[PDB]
Each structure stands twice: as structure tokens, then as C-alpha cells.
């Protein structure tokens, strides 16, 4: 449930969040966790950038999910993770920051 | 003799090709191990960057990849040598699936 580790510029422009889990019933829960680090990858710290996520049921029509600011990201988070109910096959992520930070992105899905 | 055979086994698995001049001035060679030649299908299972998340689907893909080329293998048969912990973990993972 980890999408990408490392450079913000290296965040994929499109992410496949369609998952075959449990039975043939599609998943109906989507939650995103974002964790920022310091200059060193291991030690955690804050960040300046802001992340925005969009989801598409058909891959071309996007629906707003939420936004996360790396300023609140740290050892103890203060923001609220984005939450969406419905069917999503693709995830669109856009960053607005200086870049060159090691970041964590996690996607959690539920039946 | 047991030590000899254990050393031969470990060399065949983890050896690497080399050729170097020995102390007496004569060549010294080391054989290339099994893992030296297998490069197409090498997978590191785990969490983090550079590793593959361990699930049933990943295991099925890993095991079905080797059957892509029949090659010289007759009857479509393969031999698997696995550790006890890995086999037990596979047995545990097969339980959660609605169909094993």
C-alpha cells in the first residue's frame, strides 16, 4: 500500500488504485496517508509543499478528494487524511512545493 | 566430507566468476554461482522502496513467470527448494483468500 518513495518530482502523475481484494465486490473506501521527512530519508520532519489528489471512476472524469499540506506532516500529524466513498480506478496527484524532499504516500482501501 | 559438500553447495549457490593470479604466481579461479546466471526473475519481498509487497497475487505472478518459456523443460515440471519459514508464511497467506 505504498505508491512512491523519494523525490516529489518523482511522484507518478497517475496512480492505479483499482485493487482486487476480498470477493468480487469492489472496494468502497479510500484513504490517503502522507508522511514527510527531513533532508535525510530516515529522520522525519516537516515540509513546505502541498499535495492535491483527484480520483476518476472512468479514468477521464476527475473528482476532488482532498489536499494535504506537508507543513503539518511530521512525527505527529495534525491534518486529517482524505476520505472518499465510491468506486475509483485511478488517482491523480499534483504537488505545489519546492521539491527535493523524501516523502511517504500510502493508500488504504476497504471492502 | 560433510564440510566439503556444504562448501560446494554454498559455492554453487552464491559463487561468482573470477580469475586472478595466486601467491605462487599461478592462476586462481572461482566458479560462478547459480545466482550469478539467474537475472531475469529476481524478487525482493518486503515493504519499502525497491521491494515488492507480499500478497497472494504477487506470489502467483512470481510462480507463473517461470513457465513463460518451455525451453528444454519436459512435462512442464519445476523443482522448488525453499526455507521452512518461507513455506510456513506461504501456508499462512493462503488461508486469508476466499479460494486458496
Residues in B touching A5 (Cβ below 8 Å) = 48-49
Cα separation, B13 vs B7, whole angstroms: 10
Per the structure block, which three cell numbers stand in for B73?
523443460
Question: What grid cell was written down for A101?
Answer: 524532499
Q: Which of A27, A33, A32, A34 is nearest to A85 (CA)?
A: A27
What are the grid coordinates assigned to B63, written together? 510462480
Of the candidates A50, A55, A15, A13, the one whose C-alpha atom is nearest the C-alpha of residue A34 is A50
Q: Is A106 in the B-facing interface, judged by CB distances under 8 Å?
A: no
Give me A17's grid cell: 488504485
CA distance A22 to chain B (A): 7
* Burial readout B21-38 (b: 16 or more C-beta within 10 A, e: otherwise): eeeeeeeeeeeebeeeee
With CA atoms as reference, the chain A residue closest to B57 would be: A20
Of the candidates B25, B31, B40, B28, which has an alpha carbon nearest to the alpha carbon of residue B10? Answer: B31
- Cα A108 to chain centroid distance, Å, stands at 9
Q: Which among A104, A95, A81 has a CA at the least distance from the CA of A3?
A: A104
The distance of A35 to chain B (nearest Cα, Å) reads: 13
Return the residue matching grid coordinates 530516515.
Answer: A42
Please choose, from the candidates A44, A108, A36, the residue with its C-alpha nearest in 3D space to the C-alpha of residue A79: A36
SS3 B4: helix
Query: For residues A50 and A68, what is the distance between their CA atoms, to the nearest angstrom?
Result: 6
Chain A hits for B44, Cβ within 8 Å: none
Of B49, B53, B98, the CB nearest to A5: B49
Q: Tell me which residue of A65, A75, A6, A71 sits closest to A32, measured CA to CA.
A: A65
Beta bridge partners, B27, equal B21
CA B97 to CA B57: how far, in whole Å? Answer: 10
Residue with cell 478528494: A65
The terminus-to-terminus CA distance of chain B in angstroms comes to 43
Distance CA B11, CA B65 (A): 26
Q: What is the 3-state secondary structure (H, E, C) of B24-90?
A: CCCEEEECCCHHHHCCCCCCCECCCCCCECCCHHHHHHHHHHCCCCCCCCCCCCCCCCCCHHHHHHH
Cβ atoms of residues A54 and A91 within 8 Å: yes
CA A9/CA B24 separation, integer angstroms:
55
What resolution, expressed in A, was reported for this entry?
Answer: 2.8
Q: How far is CA A98 from CA A3, A51, A95, in A?
A: 20, 12, 9
CB B93 within 8 A of CB B59: yes
Q: How far is B21 from chain A (nearest CA, A)?
A: 43
- CA B11, CA B5: separation in Å to the nearest integer? 10
Identify the helix (H) or strand (E) that includes residue A34. Answer: strand A29-36
Q: In sequence order, which residues have a C-beta less than 8 Å from that of residue A29 and are 6 or more positions away? A: A83, A84, A85, A108, A109, A110, A111
Beta bridge partners of B66: none
End-to-end CA distance of chain A: 15
Q: Which residues contact A65 (CB under 8 A, 6 or more apart)?
A: A30, A32, A53, A54, A55, A82, A84
Amino acid at each position: 500500500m505504498l505508491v512512491h518513495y523519494g523525490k516529489l518530482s518523482d511522484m507518478p502523475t497517475v496512480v492505479d488504485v483499482n485493487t482486487t481484494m476480498g470477493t468480487d465486490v469492489p472496494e468502497d473506501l479510500l484513504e490517503i496517508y502522507v508522511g514527510c521527512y527531513a533532508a535525510d530519508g530516515k529522520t522525519p520532519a516537516a515540509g513546505t509543499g502541498v499535495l492535491t489528489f483527484h480520483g476518476s471512476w472512468n479514468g477521464v472524469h476527475k473528482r476532488l478528494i482532498g489536499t494535504v499540506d506537508l507543513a503539518a506532516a511530521g512525527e505527529v500529524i495534525a491534518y486529517n487524511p482524505p476520505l472518499m466513498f465510491g468506486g475509483c480506478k485511478k488517482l491523480f496527484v499534483s504537488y505545489t512545493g519546492v521539491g527535493t524532499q523524501i516523502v511517504d504516500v500510502y493508500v488504504h482501501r476497504g471492502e | 566430507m560433510f564440510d566439503y559438500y556444504r562448501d560446494v553447495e554454498m559455492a554453487f549457490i552464491y559463487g561468482r566468476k573470477s580469475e586472478t593470479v595466486g601467491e605462487n604466481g599461478k592462476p586462481e579461479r572461482t566458479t560462478g554461482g547459480l545466482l550469478n546466471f539467474i537475472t531475469t526473475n529476481r524478487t525482493q519481498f518486503g515493504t519499502g522502496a525497491g521491494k515488492t509487497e507480499l500478497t497472494e497475487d504477487s506470489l502467483i505472478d512470481f510462480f507463473a513467470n517461470v513457465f513463460n518459456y518451455d525451453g528444454q523443460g519436459a512435462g512442464n515440471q519445476r523443482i522448488a527448494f525453499v526455507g521452512n519459514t518461507a513455506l510456513t508464511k506461504i501456508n499462512k497467506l493462503a488461508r486469508n483468500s476466499p479460494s486458496t
